[PDB]
Amino acid sequence: IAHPQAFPGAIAAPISYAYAVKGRKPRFQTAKGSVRITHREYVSVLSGTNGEFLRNNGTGPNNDFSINPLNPFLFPWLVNIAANFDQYKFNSLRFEYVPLVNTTTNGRVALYFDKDSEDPGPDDRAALANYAHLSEISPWAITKLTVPTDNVKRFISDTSSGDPKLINLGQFGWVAYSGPTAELGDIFVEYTVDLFEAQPTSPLLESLFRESASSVQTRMGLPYFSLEVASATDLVWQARVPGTYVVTIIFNSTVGGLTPSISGGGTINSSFSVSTAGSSAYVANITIRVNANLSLSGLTGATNAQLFAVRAITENAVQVV
Amino acid sequence: GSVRITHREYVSVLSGTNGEFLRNNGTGPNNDFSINPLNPFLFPWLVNIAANFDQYKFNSLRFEYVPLVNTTTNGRVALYFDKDSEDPGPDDRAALANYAHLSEISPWAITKLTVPTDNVKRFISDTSSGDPKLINLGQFGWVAYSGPTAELGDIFVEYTVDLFEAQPTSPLLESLFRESASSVQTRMGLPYFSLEVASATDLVWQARVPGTYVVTIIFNSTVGGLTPSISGGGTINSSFSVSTAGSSAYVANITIRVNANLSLSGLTGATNAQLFAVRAITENAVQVV
Amino acid sequence: AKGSVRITHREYVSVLSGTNGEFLRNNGTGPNNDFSINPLNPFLFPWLVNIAANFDQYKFNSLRFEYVPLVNTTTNGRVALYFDKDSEDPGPDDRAALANYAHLSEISPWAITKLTVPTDNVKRFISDTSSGDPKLINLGQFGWVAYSGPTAELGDIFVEYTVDLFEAQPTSPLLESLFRESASSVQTRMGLPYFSLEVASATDLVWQARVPGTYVVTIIFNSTVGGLTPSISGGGTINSSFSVSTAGSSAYVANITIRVNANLSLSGLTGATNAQLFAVRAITENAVQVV
Amino acid sequence: AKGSVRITHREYVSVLSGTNGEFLRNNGTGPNNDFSINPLNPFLFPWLVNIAANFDQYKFNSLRFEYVPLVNTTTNGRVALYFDKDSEDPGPDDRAALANYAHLSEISPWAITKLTVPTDNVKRFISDTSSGDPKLINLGQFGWVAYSGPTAELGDIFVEYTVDLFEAQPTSPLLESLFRESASSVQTRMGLPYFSLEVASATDLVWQARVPGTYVVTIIFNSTVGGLTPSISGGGTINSSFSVSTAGSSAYVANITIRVNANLSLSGLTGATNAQLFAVRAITENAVQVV
Amino acid sequence: GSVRITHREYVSVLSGTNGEFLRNNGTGPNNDFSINPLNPFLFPWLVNIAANFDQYKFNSLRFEYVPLVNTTTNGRVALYFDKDSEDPGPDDRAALANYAHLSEISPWAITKLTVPTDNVKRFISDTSSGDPKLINLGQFGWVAYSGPTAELGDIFVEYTVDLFEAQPTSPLLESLFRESASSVQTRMGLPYFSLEVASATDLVWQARVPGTYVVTIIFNSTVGGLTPSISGGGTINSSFSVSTAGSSAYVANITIRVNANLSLSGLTGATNAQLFAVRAITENAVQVV
Amino acid sequence: IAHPQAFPGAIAAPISYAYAVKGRKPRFQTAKGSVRITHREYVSVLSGTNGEFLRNNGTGPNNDFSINPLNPFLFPWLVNIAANFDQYKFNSLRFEYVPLVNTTTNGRVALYFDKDSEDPGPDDRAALANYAHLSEISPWAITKLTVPTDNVKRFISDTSSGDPKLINLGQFGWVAYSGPTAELGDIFVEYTVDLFEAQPTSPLLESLFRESASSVQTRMGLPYFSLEVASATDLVWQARVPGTYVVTIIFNSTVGGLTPSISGGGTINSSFSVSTAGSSAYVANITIRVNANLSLSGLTGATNAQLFAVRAITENAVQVV
Ligand SMILES: [Ca+2]
Ligand SMILES: [Ca+2]
Ligand SMILES: [Ca+2]
Ligand SMILES: [Ca+2]
Ligand SMILES: [Ca+2]
Ligand SMILES: [Ca+2]
Ligand SMILES: [Zn+2]
């Protein structure tokens, strides 16, 4: 109470803001035709690096900042339920940013939304302003971006099922420019979805395959991992969704073996490999963070690689060698 | 909220050749003729505004034909519209008639084609991007048969659109690049020019969209040298070149009015080439030489 | 009316910056000409310009500039936004002048403030802010000052507005053609004033960037061999580059992401005379790919 | 509307058949592509197709599939009709999957049941069910299963509906052109998918019939003499036949009454490469009469 | 108070030349075509009345094209209007279409262009005087492309104006003078004629505004002598000359119908020249000789 | 809202105060006999230097901290109006200090007023306390000093028109001791004046003249500039009122030329000089700040100097050389 040597109308700067977030139970109810879920999930931490215009942290705006739900990155918990249904319609959708940082911090954090599910980046701070659905604040403050929800059922689907403009509501994205190099705030999402048409459960595994020589890569299932380097010397996959996985990787080298590592944040808990001839196989129980890499290095004449990833817990350990 | 534009602009010159059922001037029912505000072929003017938005909805849409040709001209021009953006197009003059939305007249007379507007927002997008059935209101086309072989008339589009949801401006230039050697070519921005031939000997680009441009062509040659020429309805107004071994650069202010090619042909041992094109005017003249 | 389109939007003006122990009006830019409210002015309205290039007349219904801090809470000093109805009057030189402006707003750099300029009821022409009498074509002048603070980027200035545009016309050029000579001094410019010409020697060519953003530049000139010396004497990033230089003829194309008010320099020139700049606005994936 | 025609009708889908001690979804056909509800799909809508070939868009107002037993009252087992909104999702593999479908109907083979699929309010395109994104063009997917029964024809499945069609266009081809090579592997198809190509060897040519009915087929290919070996490896009747075969060039035309999902086989081939099928639908009095 | 005139009068003949996108007959979008009552180019009749007033406001404004040419003529004529009095004009036929106010037809047919009148009084003034954006409603223009090379049609202006505030009559003659040597030339009054060449050898003036005039040309020669000739659509009806050393005088009653020049050509060693022009009729014939 | 681990009665220190100042339109109205103006103008920035007892910034308390109005330093805008009148009477008069600085700053800023228009300085912090009209605060705070207004018309006049005690209401002044070396706050003045007796407009130029040998210097007009050094080698004038001027300087040296510069904050925009014999003349278009110097150096045997200063804008540039 009571602030020194001040006239009213003054605005007084504190040194830091604490906002307190508590756990939130989900609400289900059936609107006669639809099941309706309200819940709050954790999107991602929002970081910036110094002297960079850092868009979506590292990453950049791709196809798993697409709203559909069914999207492990945006809706970790909801994915499981949504797999049991054929189509969805968002009622309310809000992204909320809770500062991680004190008010001497400085810089800008901004949240944006665009209806073009596969809208490219805002290229710089000036472009970033042109969005219709934008929130720009100091990193030490709190804010929230409300996404306009339309009134049309679209299919619940992984981003590898025809035109993303048909299945996804839009795209979420953030930017941090100026400012320090740090983790600036939490990004939560509050939502209310209606799910329609119960069906037999969609699979929640990932199947990412490349050839070599044809140069195309094909993905089915959820985008847990992404393929970043082709090569015949190296194979690197990148974690898009933090968590523990049991990944199975099979490929065609010409003899030699492989050298696995986790560049970035992550640990390998249980390796097993068998590599020879023109066939190699590596199955592992990894825990990994967003934008970390699982690299298979020291390869020699490697074409044709396929990855199978499923969510597990650390204790689903590989036991042979 | 939304903005609403009402305007009339230039589509293309409608030509026919003798003894030939000739659709879309010989291009065939391409991707060029899909109705979408980011498509500079039908909307050279609108595209500047559409670049700033995400969605569109047409409220009114007409195409118009105004004769360049005189009253003793034989023949037929027809304007049509199919709701299916990737409709094949008609083969004979009898199939041409089955369209719901058609206008046939003598080539020396005016006619309008009124296309049915629906009530669904679709995405403003480059026509070779999303599912054409999802993003385009449909395709527009024309046919000219029973002689002669001339540039028959001008075609205008007249519309009223609502544009929704502002976004950062989609690029209003073209960046078309090819190697040579990998046979792949990537286009960025509006499809003003296409790349037609890429040999070590010659380099030609076809102008799809009529108007005045500033172009920057840069390529990897060896010894190089080059010779600019506009094949057809075109004109170089201001020219600049610099050509040595390894790399050469051409900068020009040109005006194209039909599918005219511009050719860089004196080339010896060339590979990578890139085109930059942007809608300009004649007083944006190159002046260095 | 129904040749009348009406736009409501919020876009990016500029970054408000200060230098330590200086007044610094408009980031030190100076010539209060590219701060005239016409729109059309790609400095104030970088998003509206693509639309207004297609029209002859404009009327603002509401117009408001907004300052959002980039700087932290312990920062000292003061930023100020002002507006004069006379787009031709010179800026404020001292703080005493700044305070007499009828439409002024000042707050400490870590806080948010805004300025609402008053709109009248007259249609004016969308034109160059150099294409005739300022008082006939511009609603007025905008500007900012930052004093007694540190030397840094203090905040972003946005503009929010609702305009009516009238009378569709063929598009004004959305690119820049900037020509110079040598042998003369004449410096004719055509199109938007994205870049300006600081000096054209025979040793060096310097273009200063009046408008933040990503571009694709084509610069062409007459020297006597040499050339290759490109650099950004400000905050920017030559994201893609192509050069070719021989005798009395050389050419440079590049995909720079210039910003605030940076700089473009061609250093190793030797015996240069004629020169010309071609600027268009692009993203980065419009990247040059030949070398 | 008045480019809008509205049709109400009941036509023949297919015969529902089972094999003893098997699951047997869609008679064992497999590729859940020719069971997409577009209409246009000559499997589901063999009567509507002649109309819908003249239009660009469709909207279903009511749609219902009906099972009428062909089998007697002591027959054991169970038939099941299902519908998924996602025309692209794979079929049910086990009975457990079958049961989770929201729109499902199961009854013993000697009884009558029916399934009412729910119609929405959106216009979609009449197209190939291979001419682009399934979810954009198809209302959904239909399918059936017959388990724990005998191995026989259990019943007829009819579809009853009321559609609006919109936008008259020039007619989509009501015939089939199916080409193959040798020397290659490319197998381009054009028109309705009446027949499919199982194998093109050099010894044998086998076309499987996806659509029950009476046809007039023209098959043409390149061998090195031989040819004459026509047969129906299913339920059907070559009602009329004409053959001619010499060197690298032979040709077969015939008025088959193929059905359920029968087969067409050219056996005695020798050194065959290119081949092409031409299918049109006809009666039987369209009988070939030259030999 | 105010007066209100409704009238129709002659603007200019609209011509095209073959294989050429030809605007405003070749003059280019000049100062001539600014819409203002004191501008004898668009308002040869109104100008007599406007001379007596200070301000004007158009209530109605249309331009009209009536074909001089027959039905087998190919081509295009377009009438346009831009609100910006100093609009550059269109470069190609595609930019031409972007105007809000345009009319394109076959050259053998009638067409009208209705220009939007606003509600602001502006000053009646000579068009090269005040800021063109302040004093002119806008510019009118025309283009003719796709052949042939003829005088295609007549152009009329039809309007209704309110004129405000009477003033002493602005001069209804021209006084164009040049020296020679100083390169400066001063015009006074209506811009009927322009001075095109001023050498010691020859002296030509171009008639901008169609009609019949009486002209008085006087110049400083040395020994002099002179030869009158009208280059193009023109005619001398009545001629008088007196030419000695030091100074000579020409008085003529002429009729001009397009941009025709009249040439005084036999000159030897000439400098200062002045032209006096006034709208007359044929029976105002010169009779002394 | 809500402060951590606190009992009521606590006083909580923020880290900085933002006060927001907006533009203020002037109000005119006639009290039957007088015109009455209410407005807010910018006096000066208030700075202190470290380890100094800094009184009136550099300067020191002279005759242009005198209240009269008619005083360019105290009333930039009002001067123009006041020139059209013969006498004035202040109704309300308040000086307001708005902090420029955060609350870790420390030191003291003080505002004082004294009726003796030509009261000398407070000599030290102890003397500064003895004023009756004083406000002492921390530099990070806001405050205002209300000047007692009497009820007597006095003449509107520049400080060079007889006894300053007759024409000026009093003297304003400030002090900053202890504390850092920085610009601490803005000083605004809010006022309501009555102006009486319309007359033909008083001149608003400056005429400052010195001789040499007589040693006296005489000023007419406004105190924009002041003469600081006599000399025969140098002439330095000092800006008392920030702004752009067209200054004309004429003097008697013995041949030689002159070397102009602006020591302190300021730039010269357009010079012209002609210097010879026993006469020299320099006219310039300068922009200058408070307490900067316009020096004419490299002089040689210089007696007798006169300055003419008028306010201009930068574009009134001298065009000859
Ligand atoms: Ca977008
Ligand atoms: Ca079609
Ligand atoms: Ca002013
Ligand atoms: Ca499914
Ligand atoms: Ca214009
Ligand atoms: Ca005292
Ligand atoms: Zn508090």
From Swiss-Prot, chains B, E:
Region annotated P domain, projecting, chain positions: 164-289
The UniProt keywords, alphabetically, are:
Capsid protein, RNA-binding, T=3 icosahedral capsid protein, Virion
Q: GO terms for molecular function, please? A: RNA binding; structural molecule activity
Gene Ontology CC entries for this record: T=3 icosahedral viral capsid
UniProt organism field: Cucumber necrosis virus
Q: What does this protein do?
A: Capsid protein self-assembles to form an icosahedral capsid with a T=3 symmetry, about 32-35 nm in diameter, and consisting of 180 capsid proteins.
Where is the protein situated, by its record's location annotation?
A: Virion
Subunit description = Homomultimer.
Domain of life from the UniProt record: Viruses
Q: What is its main location?
A: virion
User: Which segments carry the region annotation S domain, virion shell?
Assistant: 2-163
Q: What is this protein called?
A: Capsid protein
Q: Which family does it belong to?
A: Belongs to the icosahedral plant coat protein family.
Does the record bear RNA-binding in its keywords?
A: yes
Q: Does the keyword RNA-binding apply?
A: yes
From Swiss-Prot, chains C, D:
Q: Where is this region: P domain, projecting?
A: 166-291
GO CC list: T=3 icosahedral viral capsid
Could you list this entry's UniProt keywords, alphabetically sorted.
Capsid protein, RNA-binding, T=3 icosahedral capsid protein, Virion
Q: Which GO terms describe its molecular function?
A: RNA binding; structural molecule activity
Region span, S domain, virion shell: 4-165
**Compartment(s):** Virion
Query: What role is this protein assigned?
Result: Capsid protein self-assembles to form an icosahedral capsid with a T=3 symmetry, about 32-35 nm in diameter, and consisting of 180 capsid proteins.
**UniProt subunit comment:** Homomultimer.
Which protein family is it in?
Answer: Belongs to the icosahedral plant coat protein family.
This chain belongs to the protein called Capsid protein
Q: Which organism is it from?
A: Cucumber necrosis virus
- Included stretch of the parent chain: 90 to 380 of 380
